[PDB]
Amino acid sequence: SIIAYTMSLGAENSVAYSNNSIAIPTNFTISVTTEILPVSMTKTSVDCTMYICGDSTECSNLLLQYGSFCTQLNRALTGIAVEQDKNTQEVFAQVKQIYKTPPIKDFGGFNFSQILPDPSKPSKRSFIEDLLFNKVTKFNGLTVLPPLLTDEMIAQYTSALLAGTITSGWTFGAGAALQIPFAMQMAYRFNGIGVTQNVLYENQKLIANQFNSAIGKIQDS
Amino acid sequence: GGVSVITPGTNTSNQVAVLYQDVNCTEVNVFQTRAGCLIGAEHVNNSYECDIPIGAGICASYQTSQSIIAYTMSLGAENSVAYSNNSIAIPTNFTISVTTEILPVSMTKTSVDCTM
Amino acid sequence: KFNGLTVLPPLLTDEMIAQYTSALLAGTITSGWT
Amino acid sequence: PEAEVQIDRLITGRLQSLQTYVTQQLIRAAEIRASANLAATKMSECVLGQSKRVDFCGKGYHLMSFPQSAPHGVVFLHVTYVPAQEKNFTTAPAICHD
Amino acid sequence: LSSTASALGKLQDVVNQNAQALNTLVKQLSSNFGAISSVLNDILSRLDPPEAEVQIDRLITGRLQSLQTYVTQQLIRAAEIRASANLAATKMSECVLGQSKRVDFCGKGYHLMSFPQSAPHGVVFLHVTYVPAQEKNFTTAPAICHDGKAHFPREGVFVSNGTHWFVTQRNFYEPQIITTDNTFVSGNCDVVIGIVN
Amino acid sequence: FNGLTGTGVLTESNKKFLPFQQFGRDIADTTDAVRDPQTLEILDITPCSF
Ligand SMILES: *[C@@H]1O[C@H](CO)[C@@H](O[C@@H]2O[C@H](CO)[C@@H](O)[C@H](O)[C@H]2NC(C)=O)[C@H](O)[C@H]1NC(C)=O
Ligand SMILES: *[C@@H]1O[C@H](CO)[C@@H](O[C@@H]2O[C@H](CO)[C@@H](O)[C@H](O)[C@H]2NC(C)=O)[C@H](O)[C@H]1NC(C)=O
Ligand SMILES: *[C@@H]1O[C@H](CO)[C@@H](O[C@@H]2O[C@H](CO)[C@@H](O)[C@H](O)[C@H]2NC(C)=O)[C@H](O)[C@H]1NC(C)=O
Ligand SMILES: *[C@@H]1O[C@H](CO)[C@@H](O[C@@H]2O[C@H](CO)[C@@H](O)[C@H](O)[C@H]2NC(C)=O)[C@H](O)[C@H]1NC(C)=O
């Protein structure tokens, strides 16, 4: 039955603070977190004259009395459509050169197949990307304008950034992509957060299994 | 179909290309785009950097005599990194460069007396 | 114009803006990030 | 003359409909632009390079950012460092040998 | 800057948008708005005040609607300008005032410092950046076993020309003879994967 | 002038007026300048400073 209750503030944990005691983790886990942001809204252009007048000369004469009122609204709608294309171009095109991953996956066993686009599909998009596309679902002068960047292009832009991160690490963002072994790139990430590189190499097999499981969990979610 | 005119700068050229939105060329230099029928532009197989955005992955540039042309816009040069398990690339030489970023802090202040 | 439409001058003059930019620029050149 | 007066009442409502539609679209576009700017900042500081900002890209310590194409959207998958097992140890700020 | 006005074009575009809004108000005055004459004075001169007011009421409704649309456009433009100003303030604080560790926050490459330049209704930042000019490929090892004990470099990574092994920083190539002081010893070679001797 | 009443400072106007032209009008439809009916002398119309 529907019930009325004070909403919970979350479980309460008391930290065992001590002057002479510290807690340092003996074991760690690797997890993937998903954040989704809408880059652009669907572009729509509406003709004010067609909406206001149903092919009527008398209505058009009255619209002439309104004058610039009809023109400013149409101009604003055209500007919104241009803005959406500009926003899409800026976020997706952050890489100067399109990058493709090498055919041999010598990455230390860290699978990247499900994040990589599928060649067999007529449009090359990742299986994870296909799931995202699947989940998302007139005569009055109202029209819909297609984006300047096609969905396949958008997938190719994400693939180029993805390939640069997987093979060149952070070098592609700074400048020309520089090849680096993936295991060494993972050690650099640990060095960036301050965890020792040796710990990553010792637990590299565990990290690869955790990373593959986390990617699989994201697809299931 | 809405008539969109693809025009280069008037000083540069007087040539114009007409695009009709969401209509076939029959309703109205022949090309068909998702945005609509394209006239005044000749399709080119070669891909070039976008100069004017027709839309739907199609862009128009003035190229050779020069005429407006319709082409799929380039996605940038394609480069394959030579990834290797035992090989790394470390720069032997570097360069110092200055980059310019411009942002408008404020817009011109305008006050209008509604009564006047 | 004469319809009651007016443009208001900014509180900070262009020369004052140049003096501000210069102060930040001089601090970066001589004192670094301090 | 009579028909035009009735048409004028419809025109005022129809013009108002376009004005309201444009205003709502502009407000939605501004919110979308802010989200796009945040997405661009995340792509630059997470997919392109490691981010030292705390919780900028997911809970835990972000290592790398992955972007997946979405309709009118961008998806970032961030590898993060989370402790699995934690133990308590006696600690000293400083230690004296000599 | 001299060759292209496109860089200052966005600042000019903001000024043009303000000018266009003022021009739109001027166009509105020309519009009849259903009145016999667009000019208020023309209606007043040819009609009695009670009669003139009805024609004025139609002009007022159109003029008030135009002012509301103009105010809304200015408010939306001001909100966009305020967001740009907030970004500019963030850039000045984390680039001009101090070095930024954020990637591509101030230009492509590794930002070192930024210089502020005055612009009309705008701010310009010049950021010095570190970009690799020449890059070479070297054989690399995650760890090296001097006596069967894995060694990991405290700073930089192992590189090999094909005759000798050296330790150098990732950012720039500065080959150095490997030393026990240079590389800490942790773990064992068998646990490490891809390790060399 | 010509059945139109306006309040403004009256000064001679540099802009030439063709014989057919009797008035100069802004896009806003406000009359920037008028030519006197009694004598054909070009006068600039400037609204009193506000
Ligand atoms: C990616 O995942 C595949 C499948 O799990 C891995 O291939 C497996 O490797 C283990 C260990 O050698 C074998 O026992 C399995 O039989 C393999 N399965 C298949 C289907 O080949 C692969 O090593 C992982 N890493 C890569 C190459 O990306
Ligand atoms: C450290 O934590 C990880 C992650 O919890 C442990 O790995 C798990 O091991 C169990 C038992 O074999 C499996 O059922 C889980 O699926 C593993 N998780 C993953 C994703 O790796 C690891 O065993 C722990 N190590 C220690 C020291 O206890
Ligand atoms: C590289 O050096 C290591 C360490 O000396 C070698 O590993 C040893 O291999 C022998 C023979 O299998 C074992 O008896 C030792 O116990 C190993 N030591 C350890 C724990 O690392 C390794 O075999 C050498 N590799 C090459 C190619 O010479
Ligand atoms: C592997 O490194 C050795 C480092 O000694 C290189 O030998 C040096 O080469 C430079 C450049 O010709 C000379 O100036 C040094 O005098 C050489 N040193 C010695 C000890 O001979 C060797 O050429 C390198 N091999 C490659 C392929 O670069």
Find chain F residues with C-beta within 8 A of E45's C-beta.
3-5
Mutate to test the interface with E, among D21, D44, D56 (most CBs of E within 10 A): D44
CA distance C11 to chain F (A): 21
Contact in structure between B79 and A98 (CB atoms under 8 Å): yes
Q: After which residues is chain C broken (C to N over 2.5 A)?
A: none
Element (H, E) at D4: helix D2-42
Ligand nearest to the CA of A110: 1
* Burial (Cβ within 10 Å: 0-12, 13-18, ≥19) of residue D85: exposed
* Burial (Cβ within 10 Å: 0-12, 13-18, ≥19) of residue A116: buried
CB contact under 8 A, A132 and D75: yes
Choose which residue among E163, E166, E173 to substitute to test ligand 4 binding: the one with the highest number of ligand atoms within 8 A of its C-beta. E163
Distance of CA E28 to the CA centre of its chain: 37
Cα F45 to Cα A131, F12, F42: the distances in Å are 69, 9, 10
CA distance E73 to chain D (A): 9
Strands (E), chain F: 8-12, 23-25, 31-35, 42-47
CB contact under 8 A, E142 and A179: no
Nearest to A153 by CA among A209, A91, A103, A101: A91
CB contact under 8 A, C33 and E92: no
**Ligand 1, residues at Cβ distance < 6 Å:** A 105, 107, 109, 111
Left, alpha or beta for E5 (phi > 0: left; psi -120 to 50: alpha)?
alpha
CB contact under 8 A, E29 and F30: yes
CA distance D45 to chain E (A): 5
Cα E55 to Cα A74, C4, E24, E46, E51: the distances in Å are 28, 22, 22, 11, 7
Given the CA of residue E163, which atom of ligand 4 is nearest to it? 1
Alpha carbon of B35 to ligand 1 centroid (Å): 45
Determine the Cα–Cα distance for residues A76 and A69; give it in Å rounded to an integer.
11
Q: Write phi, then psi, for A10 (nearest 5 degrees).
A: 100, 160
Q: How many CA atoms lie within 13 A of E192 on its CB side?
A: 24
Q: Which residue's structure tokens are 């096609």?
A: A150
Contact in structure between E72 and D23 (CB atoms under 8 Å): yes
Determine the Cα–Cα distance for residues A217 and E148; give it in Å rounded to an integer.
39
- Asked whether E6 lines ligand 4 (CB < 6 A), one says no
Find chain E residues with C-beta within 8 A of D52's C-beta.
101
Find chain E residues with C-beta within 8 A of C17's C-beta.
118
CB contact under 8 A, E26 and F26: yes
Residue located nearest, by CA, to atom 24 of ligand 2: A27
- Could you tell me which residues come within 8 angstroms of residue E126 by beta carbon, excluding any fewer than 6 positions away? B98, B99, B100, E114, E115, E117
Provide the number of CB pairs (under 8 Å) joining chain A to chain B: 80
Find chain E residues with C-beta within 8 A of C27's C-beta.
97
Maximal CA-CA distance, chain C: 52
Nearest to B114 by CA among E68, F28, E21, E41: E68
Q: Write phi, then psi, for A201 (nearest 5 degrees).
A: -65, -40
CA distance F10 to chain E (A): 19
Determine the Cα–Cα distance for residues E84 and E86; give it in Å rounded to an integer.
5
Residue located nearest, by CA, to atom 22 of ligand 4: E163
CA distance E97 to chain B (A): 16
Q: What DSSP string describes A166-179?
A: HHHTTHHHHSS---
Q: After which residues is chain B broken (C to N over 2.5 A)?
A: 28, 64
Neighbours of chain C (3+ CB pairs under 8 A): B, E, F
What residue in B sits closest to A148 (Cα-Cα)? B55
Determine the Cα–Cα distance for residues B35 and B88; give it in Å rounded to an integer.
46
* Contact with chain A for residue D34, Cβ under 8 A: no
Determine the Cα–Cα distance for residues E136 and E168; give it in Å rounded to an integer.
13
* Contact with chain F for residue C7, Cβ under 8 A: no
Determine the Cα–Cα distance for residues A32 and D77; give it in Å rounded to an integer.
6
Q: What DSSP string describes A109-175?
A: S---TTTSBPSSSSS--BHHHHHHHHH----SSEEEPPPSS-HHHHHHHHHHHHHHHHHHTTHHHHS
Helix spans in chain E (H): 9-30, 40-46, 49-91
Provide the number of CB pairs (under 8 Å) joining chain A to chain E: 86
* Contact with chain E for residue B86, Cβ under 8 A: yes
- Asked whether E194 lines ligand 4 (CB < 6 A), one says no
